[PDB]
Each structure stands twice: as structure tokens, then as C-alpha cells.
Amino acid sequence: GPVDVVFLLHATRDNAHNAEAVRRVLERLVSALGPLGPQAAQVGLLTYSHRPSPLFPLNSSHDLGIILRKIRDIPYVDPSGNNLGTAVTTAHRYLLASNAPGRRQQVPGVMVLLVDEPLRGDILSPIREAQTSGLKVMALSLVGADPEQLRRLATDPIQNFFAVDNGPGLDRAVSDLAVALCQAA
Ligand SMILES: [Mg+2]
Ligand SMILES: [Mg+2]
């Protein structure tokens, strides 16, 4: 069935060296959603440093080729910063809210969190409010992240996946999340 998915990525000059690995991850996750279309899957994207950067809304395009180029051209230019909290809030207010561009009513909304560093500041309040508004929150913790942080948010439990390494550990986590996304519709 139809689904509105918005991915949240940590993107700075500090983790620019992992951009290609993350791109391949996102490609698999976008594939997991099935055909893109106004009556099918939609994808939005926001990145975060200390500040949030919405890159494109759910209805920016249904052309898979264009969407993947946008992902390819994600700016990794910002200074150091890992403010996931404000990112969640911004993605909610401007990309997944009922009034957001391309957001479809009676369609499940999903917020997918990519994390690769220990989290600073409050994430509990933004995530809880996203859940309360009816959004499904999922998180992929990449190598470098603290795997316990997004597991101890007690708000409803999150579907968490942790890459214990950048190899098979990563592959398993991504596959598990891909299955989880397929079921979210
Ligand atoms: Mg083209
Ligand atoms: Mg950083």
C-alpha cells in the first residue's frame, strides 16, 4: 500500500568520508518501499548537523532516477554537530505534518533516523511528539553510534537496528530495516 517516508541523515564535513556507504544504504531502503508514485510510495529527505536541512519533500519527484541523484548530491558541507532532536522536529513540522508538501492523508507516515555518533541534547521529546501525532519512527544506528540511546526512550518503543560493523553487521541491519519498511505500509 501507499506510504510517506522521510529519511533523516547526519551530514557534515566530519562524516563526509562515509557518504558513499550511506548512499548505498539509502538505495536499498528506497528500493524496499516499492514503486514510487502519487498512489504508491513517496520519499522525502532531511539532513542535520547542528542545524536541520530539509532537502526535498515527499512529492518532489516520483522519478527514481532523479531521487537517487538528489541523494547522490547530498551536501556534506556543514561544520561539526549532531543535533538529532531539532532534526526530528523540523522533519515533522515541515515534511511529515498533515499540511506538509506531498503528505497524503489516510496514508502511513514514517520517519527513518540514521545515526552515526553519540547523541547530545534531548531526542526524547521530539520523537515522542512525532509518535503521538501518528508517525512511525524507525532508527538505523551505524558504526560510531551509541546503540542504547534510541532504545532507552521511556513514549512507545522504536524499531531499532544497529550495525555492529561496516561489513556483514551493516548488511544485516539494513536488511532488517528494509523488511521493517515494507511492513510499515
Ligand atoms: Mg535526466
Ligand atoms: Mg559531527
Side-chain angles (χ1 to χ4, degrees):
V3 65
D4 290 333
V5 180
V6 174
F7 297 89
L8 282 73
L9 273 70
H10 186 211
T12 67
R13 298 190 300 264
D14 287 329
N15 71 345
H17 65 284
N18 292 330
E20 172 57 20
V22 170
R23 184 185 66 81
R24 294 297 304 272
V25 169
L26 277 183
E27 282 188 324
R28 291 164 64 182
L29 298 179
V30 170
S31 287
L33 300 175
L36 307 182
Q39 306 300 326
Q42 277 181 325
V43 180
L45 182 78
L46 176 145
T47 67
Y48 62 91
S49 57
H50 176 66
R51 297 173 178 178
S53 292
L55 296 189
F56 59 85
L58 292 156
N59 65 346
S60 76
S61 179
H62 298 112
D63 192 335
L64 185 62
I66 295 175
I67 293 295
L68 293 188
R69 188 176 65 242
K70 289 181 178 297
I71 291 174
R72 188 199 70 181
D73 294 340
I74 287 168
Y76 285 77
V77 298
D78 278 25
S80 73
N82 194 34
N83 194 344
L84 176 61
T86 62
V88 169
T89 302
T90 305
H92 180 185
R93 187 170 185 85
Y94 297 104
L95 298 179
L96 279 173
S98 60
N99 62 337
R103 185 72 171 96
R104 298 167 293 178
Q105 60 186 66
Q106 280 67 78
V107 173
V110 186
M111 189 182 294
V112 182
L113 315 182
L114 301 213
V115 181
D116 68 344
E117 277 187 354
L119 293 165
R120 51 183 192 91
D122 186 88
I123 52 169
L124 183 70
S125 161
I127 288 173
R128 180 170 62 207
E129 176 48 41
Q131 287 179 323
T132 306
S133 70
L135 303 170
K136 304 214 193 80
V137 182
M138 308 183 184
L140 170 64
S141 294
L142 302 168
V143 174
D146 183 356
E148 292 299 331
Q149 287 189 302
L150 287 171
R151 298 178 60 84
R152 300 182 181 181
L153 296 175
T155 136
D156 306 327
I158 289 172
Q159 283 176 276
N160 277 278
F161 310 94
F162 174 57
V164 296
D165 56 57
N166 283 310
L170 178 56
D171 293 328
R172 283 195 302 277
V174 174
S175 296
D176 289 346
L177 175 54
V179 172
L181 282 168
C182 168
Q183 297 172 349

